[PDB]
């Protein structure tokens, strides 16, 4: 356990908890985008995932929202054996975007971006960055400080695809009972490329809060004085470490492909490796964070970081992230752990 890590955790907490009108500005903007969307024939059934979210743990002005469409009786077809990327096949409100049997993501996104750019001019009471990529579909910069990512997703209440059968390896930590209840939850499909095909990536981002709010082997983890763990604190420090390193080397392109998603995936693999609440005592914060730092470094060094839900999907493969980029991050983190983390300064 370190007083530096603890002081950083206290700073992050005060930044997160203090009075901000930001979420209110975003809510206004989102509720009017959603209203103008429900007027359109194809986007009539659109809704916010949860009735907001943040990618970066340090920046309270950067937001992350999902607009979802329930797609009952969905037919999925795995693209090029990618395990995570699928064609969407099936009258219903989404027949307008069809090309034969396959549902077009590019055409759906073109209409989505069109209606938002139009509503950006409507709200005179917000600069839209039409940055290429399906997920997030759009990034708004409300005023000169606030940033909002909007993702369009399809929701399916059918059993999770076969590629997930060995994923969510939580049975020795959270129990097979919990693994089974979670697998009954829906799954999402976001427009993404594995670069010119009508493919959708499987998303289980909604499962994170479910586990983070009930993360112990003990049902009483963090519910009392004698059972306070450092799992969330470790996850927060891992995320801040990457954010600060990305900010430190933003002028070069070497850390552009790394995201908090990679940090989260590696952190949850350490949760599977260390299932006992005793392997996460709050007093051992320093050691636990280091087991997290060591595991992520091993991931980069071996070019192996499995999608937590799709074991055959390597987030760190040479085809997704180059060796040079991973070695650059490996060197940067090694310098941070061998200089008392200079990013955690103040
Ligand atoms: C145990 C466990 C559980 C869950 C995950 C998980 C899985 C996935 C995944 O895609 O399967 C993730 N994806 C991202 C990044 N996204 C960026 C875009 N945001 C849009 C949004 C905005 C608002 C509301 C919904 C959606 C959501 C967060 N974190 C993810 C985390 C992991 Cl690793 C382990
Ligand atoms: Cl925080
Ligand atoms: Cl992310
Ligand atoms: Zn706990």
Curated annotation (Swiss-Prot):
It catalyses: GTP + ATP = 2',3'-cGAMP + 2 diphosphate; GTP + ATP = pppGp(2'-5')A + diphosphate; pppGp(2'-5')A = 2',3'-cGAMP + diphosphate. 2',3'-cGAMP binds at residues 64, 149, 192, 201. It comes from the Eukaryota. It is a peripheral membrane protein. Changing residue 219 to R: No effect on stimulation of interferon production. The modification (Microbial infection) Deamidated glutamine is found at residues 276, 279. The record marks 149-150 as: Cleavage. A motif (KKH-loop) lies at residues 252-254. Induction: By type I interferons. Mg(2+) binds at residues 62, 64, 149. The modification 5-glutamyl glutamate is found at residue 144. Changing residue 50 to D: More than 75% inhibition of interferon beta production. Belongs to the mab-21 family. This is Cyclic GMP-AMP synthase. It comes from Homo sapiens.
């Amino acid at each position: 356990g370190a007083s530096k890590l603890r002081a950083v955790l206290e700073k992050l907490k005060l930044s997160r908890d203090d009075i901000s009108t930001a979420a209110g500005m975003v809510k206004g903007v989102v509720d009017h985008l959603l209203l103008r969307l429900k007027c359109d024939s194809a986007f009539r059934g659109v809704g916010l995932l949860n009735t907001y979210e943040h990618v970066k743990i340090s920046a309270p002005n950067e937001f992350d929202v999902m607009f979802k469409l329930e797609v009952p009786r969905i037919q999925l077809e795995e693209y090029s054996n990618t395990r995570a990327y699928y064609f969407v096949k099936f009258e219903n409100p989404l027949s307008q975007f069809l090309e034969g049997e396959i549902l077009s993501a590019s055409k759906m996104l073109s209409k989505f971006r069109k209606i938002i750019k139009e509503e950006i001019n409507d709200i005179k009471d917000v600069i839209m960055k039409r940055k290429r990529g399906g997920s997030p579909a759009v990034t708004l910069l409300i005023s000169e400080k606030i940033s909002v990512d909007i993702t369009l997703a399809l929701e399916s209440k059918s059993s999770w695809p076969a590629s997930t059968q060995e994923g969510l390896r939580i049975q020795n930590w959270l129990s097979a009972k919990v693994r089974k209840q979670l697998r009954l939850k829906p799954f999402y499909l976001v427009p993404k490329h594995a670069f010119q095909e009508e493919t959708w990536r499987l998303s289980f981002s909604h499962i994170e809060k479910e586990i983070l709010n009930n993360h112990g082997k003990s049902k009483t983890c963090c519910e009392n004085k004698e059972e306070k763990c450092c799992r969330k604190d470790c996850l927060k420090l891992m995320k801040y470490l990457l954010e600060q390193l990305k900010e430190r080397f933003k002028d070069k392109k070497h850390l552009d492909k790394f995201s908090s998603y990679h940090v989260k995936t590696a952190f949850f693999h350490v949760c599977t490796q260390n299932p006992q609440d005793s392997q996460w005592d709050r007093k051992d914060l320093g050691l636990c964070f280091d087991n997290c730092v060591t595991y992520f470094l091993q991931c980069l060094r071996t070019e192996k970081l499995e999608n937590y839900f799709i074991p055959e999907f390597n987030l760190f493969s040479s085809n997704l992230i180059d060796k040079r980029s991973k070695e650059f991050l490996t060197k940067q983190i090694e310098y941070e752990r061998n200089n008392e983390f200079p990013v955690f300064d103040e």
